[PDB]
Nucleic acid binder design. Sequence first.
RNA 1: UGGCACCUCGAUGUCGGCUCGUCGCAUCCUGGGGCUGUAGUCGGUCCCAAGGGUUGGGCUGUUCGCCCAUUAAAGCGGCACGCGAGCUGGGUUCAGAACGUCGUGAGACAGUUCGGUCCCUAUCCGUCGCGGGCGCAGGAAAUUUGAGAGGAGCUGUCCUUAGUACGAGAGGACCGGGAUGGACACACCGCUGGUGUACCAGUUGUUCCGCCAGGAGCAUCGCUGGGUAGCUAUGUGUGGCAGGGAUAAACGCUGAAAGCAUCUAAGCGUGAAGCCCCCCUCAAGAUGAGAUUUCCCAUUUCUUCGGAAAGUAAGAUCCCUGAAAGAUGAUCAGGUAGAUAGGUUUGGAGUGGAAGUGUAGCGAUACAUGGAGCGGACAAAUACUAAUCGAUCGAGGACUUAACC
Lengths: 122, 206, 103, 122, 53
Amino acid sequence: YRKLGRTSSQRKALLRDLATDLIVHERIETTEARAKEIRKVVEKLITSGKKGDLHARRQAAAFIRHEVVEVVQVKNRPVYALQKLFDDVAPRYAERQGGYTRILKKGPRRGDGAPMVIIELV
Amino acid sequence: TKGILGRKVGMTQVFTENGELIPVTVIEAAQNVVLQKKTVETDGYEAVQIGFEDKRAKLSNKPEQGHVAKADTTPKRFIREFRDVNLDEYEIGAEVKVDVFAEGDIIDATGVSKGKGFQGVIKRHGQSRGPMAHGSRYHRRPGSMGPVAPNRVFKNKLLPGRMGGEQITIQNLEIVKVDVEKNVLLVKGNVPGAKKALVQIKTATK
Amino acid sequence: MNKLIDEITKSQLNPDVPSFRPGDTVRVHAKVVEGTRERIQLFEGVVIKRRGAGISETFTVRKISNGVGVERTFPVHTPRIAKLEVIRRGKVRRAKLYYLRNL
Amino acid sequence: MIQQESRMKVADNSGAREVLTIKVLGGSGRKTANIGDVVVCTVKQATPGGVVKKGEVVKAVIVRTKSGARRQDGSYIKFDENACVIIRDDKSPRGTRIFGPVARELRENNFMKIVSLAPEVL
Amino acid sequence: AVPFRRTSKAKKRKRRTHVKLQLPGMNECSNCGEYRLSHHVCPECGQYDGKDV
RNA sequence: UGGCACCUCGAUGUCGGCUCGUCGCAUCCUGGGGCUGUAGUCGGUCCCAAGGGUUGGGCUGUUCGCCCAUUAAAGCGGCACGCGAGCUGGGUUCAGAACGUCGUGAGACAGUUCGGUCCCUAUCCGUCGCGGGCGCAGGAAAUUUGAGAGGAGCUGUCCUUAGUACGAGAGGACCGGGAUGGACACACCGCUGGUGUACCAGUUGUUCCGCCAGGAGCAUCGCUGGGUAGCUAUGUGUGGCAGGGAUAAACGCUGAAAGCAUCUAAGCGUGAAGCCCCCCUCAAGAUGAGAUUUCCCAUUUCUUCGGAAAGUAAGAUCCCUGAAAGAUGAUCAGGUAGAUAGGUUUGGAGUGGAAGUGUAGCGAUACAUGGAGCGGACAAAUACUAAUCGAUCGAGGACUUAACC
Ligand SMILES: [Mg+2]
Ligand SMILES: [Mg+2]
Ligand SMILES: [Mg+2]
Ligand SMILES: [Mg+2]
Ligand SMILES: [Mg+2]
Ligand SMILES: [Mg+2]
Ligand SMILES: [Mg+2]
Ligand SMILES: [Mg+2]
Ligand SMILES: [Mg+2]
Ligand SMILES: [Mg+2]
Ligand SMILES: [Mg+2]
Ligand SMILES: [Mg+2]
Ligand SMILES: [Mg+2]
Ligand SMILES: [Mg+2]
Ligand SMILES: [Mg+2]
Ligand SMILES: [Mg+2]
Ligand SMILES: [Mg+2]
Ligand SMILES: [Zn+2]
């Protein structure tokens, strides 16, 4: 696996943040190496969401971030990213075995020349 | 004097008849074919050329197809030459099987060793390192480059550089088992290379 | 792991070994084979660890003899073990029982 | 693995109790000794009233090591201590009794009296 | 540690033989006819593989 | 040990050790031999021989030396007393202080004693690795010969021949055969172990996820018990085998000059760890650019011949997915004629019995469901995701003579 310029705990935090971002926004822009790691991370999360039971949910809750996706008027109650993963994203790919993300190359960044890429869950 | 080509599969152990326990290397040697015979009146020396592994037509070119079309076979991934053989055997287009060897034979194993990258003197050359305490600032360094008089440094002053990936021969290895149906040869000991590496198995020269 | 290695080494795989775990007491009947005469010697003790896979799996047995601790390591499928008995089954929480050395 | 300056517990009846090794015999640059090897050594502790006295230079055979031996059938043996037996110019002991278990490798090296006097030959 | 002699113009120009840079790997877009990098999205129409991105 | 004062005072770092060696032979061991006050055993001395080998500690800053314990042996010298832009700084050789001694004194003693700043980002050659260009009279893909070069080269003990030969006895072999070591070298991870910061478990403090339950952050990876792949030694496998050609010192055969004799002059033969081979690796830029098998062919424009350019063939690359490779280039496996990488599904090592629920207990907790749950890097299937689509480079083969035709 890739060390991404940072220690173990910093790398874990970066991976958790990026995976939650891709779940919430469904399309993000980043560098190529980060995309090639969150590929694995996010697809394992989606598989856990497809499995569906309480053990899988508690395992996904140890990695996903506690963030609010939206507030829904149902008494207005917020929706969290774990709820979106288990209730919305996972049923979308109930008939697809693998490969829930794709990577699309964009080009270099002005400030440092880094190769920037788009990753989306489709 | 016999020869064959194979791939290194792995490394394991077997129990002998006495109850001993010995380590073995597994060589898989399917699809060997005789491709060409070199004679003194045409080449200057005598040898037999053997091709080892079948490969897809997409991965070959016209010269390869032309060369193997004389032996009525598909293009081969590896091709090598064996000298000090008897050319009265080895018909063109014939098959070579692990039957040429029997349990108890003594062989020579040729391969290319595992690759290490850029390496320093004490790993590459087994040098001795300096003191680690007592005020020293000299730990993993090459040593003195030489005396003062020549105004230069001599050849074979050993320095860092690329380490592995060299041709190695190991002599006097014993064959423990031959399995014709699986095309498998069991050799006592170990051979150079990593897994899936090409190995030449030949009769020992001494 | 390799499938060819598994198929080649399958015939030499002993089927008479019983089930045991690290932690329980066993008795080993080992063939002591001198030059011309072979006898049977008994080693009884606690299984301290089990390690490996397939034909290259080994296990270690610990005993106290005459005030000195002795450890003995065998291949599981060796033909020099005439037979293996499980005397009693223990209750441990570990796979490797190295803390008994210091105890 | 017994090299110079390593100490051993004496496992026989003679007056010695602890011994420090001076030299491993059998070659110019030899460094370590195993079970069944002879060493030159000096007596560090002794039992008052015994045949062997403190400060004596003697030679001894190693009868059990904490890094033991491997047999040809593929098995191993190991002990919880390093122990030696004080011997003469021939391979005979200088005591009348031998304590603790002894390795089977003493028999191949033709230390017959030590093997016969031992409580157990493992 | 320190240069014994100054470097001449010819020697400096010889050392600078390989300090050039390469030419981008680009070709024309099948959709809009503009130039683009291979295996990259077209920045002028947002196309890749003949689809909107 | 000295003599001289020829280079260096706009600086040529000075003892001992460490790291790394290389050379000479006046040879310490091992190999061959002549003489002996050579019976045998053990030795002495000289000749040939530099292939390899030639120890760990106590004391002292020490070199040297003495001692302890080994070894086949513990050689002697050169290289700025080899090696400080490679290291150390114990000693010598600054400033402080003290003893003995000398001086009226300030001070001094190469007498002693305790303490005392070791700078530099490598330009050129040289050394060790890795690329690009062009050449090698057409353009390509593989397989190779070997001029030349580097490596390796060591040696112990035990059994038998045989208590024989020899000797008054005491004692005690050569030559030959067999077994097993030390030190060194190469390869590798099946075994024994080490490591294993995105693997499994236990646990302390505090903060957080609204609370319980279950979890997350920080505390060296918080600490503690294990451990996969990979990398490794102290682990395992193998090696220096058996020989050939010509010789050294030496011992002879034949043989004259010199009717004899003579190893020499003509001519032959034995004869060393040494020489050249045998063994391992590199090697055609070996500009002397070698050889074999296979593939593509004789296009179109201009030129005044020379020749130029412009589409290609066989073949390669740009770009992209990577690892068995790797600083980067390079190398190798692949790009839908697809298992190259990730995911998915089944496994494997490893750890040791998940969550939820139920039962027993006042409770800490125990038991069942159930070798359970988890499971980086390991295995096999599977085109779900990305290797889409383009583009670039790349021959038309000079002259002379001789053989065939
Ligand atoms: Mg990477
Ligand atoms: Mg990047
Ligand atoms: Mg590598
Ligand atoms: Mg590398
Ligand atoms: Mg340091
Ligand atoms: Mg030990
Ligand atoms: Mg000690
Ligand atoms: Mg001056
Ligand atoms: Mg000392
Ligand atoms: Mg000796
Ligand atoms: Mg000198
Ligand atoms: Mg250095
Ligand atoms: Mg010509
Ligand atoms: Mg701390
Ligand atoms: Mg740990
Ligand atoms: Mg030889
Ligand atoms: Mg399990
Ligand atoms: Zn476009």
